[PDB]
Amino acid sequence: SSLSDQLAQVASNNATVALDRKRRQKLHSASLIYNSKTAATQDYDFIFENASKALEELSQIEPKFAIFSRTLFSESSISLDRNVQTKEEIKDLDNAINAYLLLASSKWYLAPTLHATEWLVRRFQIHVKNTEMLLLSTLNYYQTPVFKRILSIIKLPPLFNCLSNFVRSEKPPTALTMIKLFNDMDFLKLYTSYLDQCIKHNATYTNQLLFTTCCFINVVAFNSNNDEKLNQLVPILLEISAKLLASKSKDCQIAAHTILVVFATALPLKKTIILAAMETILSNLDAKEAKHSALLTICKLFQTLKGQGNVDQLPSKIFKLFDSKFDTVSILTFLDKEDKPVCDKFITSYTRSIARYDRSKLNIILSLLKKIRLERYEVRLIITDLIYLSEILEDKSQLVELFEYFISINEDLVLKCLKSLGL
Amino acid sequence: KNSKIFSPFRIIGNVSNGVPFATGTLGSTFYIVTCVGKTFQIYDANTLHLLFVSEKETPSSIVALSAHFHYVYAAYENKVGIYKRGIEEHLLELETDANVEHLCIFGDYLCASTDDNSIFIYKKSDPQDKYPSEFYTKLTVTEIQGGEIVSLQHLATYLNKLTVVTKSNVLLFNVRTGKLVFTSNEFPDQITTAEPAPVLDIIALGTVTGEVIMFNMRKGKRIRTIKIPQSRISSLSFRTDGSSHLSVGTSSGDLIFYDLDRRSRIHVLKNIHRESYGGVTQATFLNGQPIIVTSGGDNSLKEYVFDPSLSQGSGDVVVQPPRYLRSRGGHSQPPSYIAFADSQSHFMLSASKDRSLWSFSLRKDAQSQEMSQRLHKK
Amino acid sequence: PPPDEEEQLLAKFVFGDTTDLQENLAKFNADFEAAWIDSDDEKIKVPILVTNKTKKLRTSYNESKINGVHYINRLRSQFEKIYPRPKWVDDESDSNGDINALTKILSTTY
């Protein structure tokens, strides 16, 4: 390891120590609102009074920031220095600042947040000591002068070389570049960790979730050919969706639904995986819009998968959960919806499950068959299981009515079924 | 049948004939002992150069290998040969007609395991002696105790307790007593490999089904269970570097790096050894280093390395995928034809039945290079 | 005599003591038995001052021998000093439909 490398390491360690006047004017001139000159000339007192006003406004907006006023925004906070504290106190600072960035990721359209974060930059040197958290915080505002300035003053950790090419230009970074960024595989793990933190602290919001889910969609879209890449990329996005469903916010539920839909339609998953996705969605379904989206997602997943045992009967627990969280009338009007999304394999499996399990709502079964335009082999499977249930259970008027419905619609298939097995 | 003109010297183009290798240290120079059929070689591990080679052929093939600091203990058909620098320096005949099948050494007690579930314990004649030569005692395990002897281990911090792992359960034997001091519960699945974790009193057991039982000896209970289906676990190793990663070598020729702290899967390597020759026959993290050495059954020995993370803040979460590092290899089938590439007797071409062409160095085998088959354009 | 409260406050201001801030940072939080025993292993005793490794292990100048149990508790402390104890074993053990079935299947499949 060459001496040049070892000294580069030591320079990294001593990045934030101002060992002489010139280096100090650099570290102090880097700032968020004021240009280099005024930044270099002004003082901690001025910056801090602005910060106090701004954070007071933000606390008035929502009461959470008071703790930061207590711990990072005192005259003692004017006094202290990063460099002359011990390792433990350094970690405490880092935890506090990460929490503050998590809170402040939500109001990056407020000059109050701009001013307060400007204090934090200028006194605690976040723009050097901890830039991953800052970038991850503000990444979804990527079309804004605030983000352009963060790039201008930041030093880029090795993952963000795309933004590196866009530092100090004049045009904002583009969607395609952000898609390269996310298309990386390590950065995906990083951003996964960030979302996990956001969820566990219940600090998520629409615009952020929109950007996250759109980026994930485009990631799988660009990777829509390299199937090895898709296979190794499954665990990351599907774990993100797992936790995003474990959350409670309807926004999280919808985002997880969308990611799951696109991922399944772009890559054919296994029956067990699609089953588990169903189970989790059904477990955490709570409200109306989430219900709507989850139903569409399930339909699409079963229209995807295709293999031996394609439309087999749903397992007991999954079927019970599904009928618990969904009503026959609800699915009926869903079929009656004018769009009528193609629920073919899903409806077939649902019907077979009902036939094996309930054996009561046969008239709803009939309404289903009339409402949906089925297909040949699916109908044949239905007829086969119907023959089996007829030979097992007592004969029913609605049952023979179903048979008559088949007579009106392709009795000949009934004929093939019975001649293959029966009279 | 001894000649009068020629005398056997050494064997090119073999790095491992399939039996598990063993690692060891001499101060800093980490070394890897690997068998080749009727003889065994000792590689360096910083460059995978050659350091020593057994000068005297064993009458039959070596079955089990082990190595403490400076001595290598080989165990072929009936005996145990204690070797120093590849020179046979003490034979040890066993008082049976069976074959020794496992071997472990610790303290002043060597312990061998022969296929009739028979354990032999040998002691040094003196605390300051170098290798054990006195026969201390003999033990046997019958079917009521456990099945066939799968492996022998010596957990850290155990006076004269030898752990024996069998196809059904685990036994602890106090040898200076010659007694069974604790037996385990019964495991539903045949046990296929064992390893002593760097933490205390924990041994990792790989089954024939995708089961890794991390079992504690004191509390006598399965601390943890890691599930991999449709896979025959074949090797275990632990990361002593300072991060809690486990490497599982599965006989289908794959490698799986798990993180125990997050119950997670860092990375999986596919086809790092030809499956048909047994897949991973041993994988081992070098102590205190982020370097995994894997030997297969296809005459191949490799070293992969873990880079430091790229994330300045996250790190342990965004852990790097392993990078391939340096390796050596030979033919899969016996060579068909050989020739000398030059007058200075440095390189030898050998073409084998594996549809392959190779050039093997003669001085220090660091240069076992396969000649690519990449057509020039017309 | 102890200082008054306002005196403590003025002293904090004048000296620039930050220990209050340090304390707030430290208190800061995101609010939003064996199975088998061996008698002879217990009653065994070994010498101490005869080798340098045991000499570095020991804790008393004048002791020369110790019983097996103390010897092992202390040798175990040594081994712990060699390899730090990790949390995955330290503080964790295994021993309507759920939410984490998807994660379980992800774990089980390649």
């Binding site: 390891s1 090795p158 993952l159 070389n161 795309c162 590196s164 090419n165 390269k180 990386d184 390590d186 950065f187 | 240290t25 800093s28 980490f30 591990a45 910083n46 403490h68 050494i105 610790f106 303290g107 002043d108 007690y109 605390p127 010596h154 850290a156 911090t157 155990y158 006076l159 004269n160 200076r176 002593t240 070098l286 102590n287 205190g288 280093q289 982020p290 370097i291 390395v305 880079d307 790229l310 990078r323 590092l325 | 002879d40 009653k43 065994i44 005793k45 070994v46 490794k53 045991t54 021998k65 010897y71 040798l75 081994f79 060699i82």
Partner: peptide
């Protein structure tokens, strides 16, 4: 530009370990 995955050298430092000789001891 894409993220640079630079390979570097690895120098295996000293790896202090445990002693089974210390593990095994003579009786009283």
């Amino acid at each position: 530009p894409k993220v640079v995955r630079e390979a570097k050298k690895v120098e295996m430092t000293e790896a202090r370990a445990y002693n089974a000789d210390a593990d095994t001891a003579k009786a009283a």
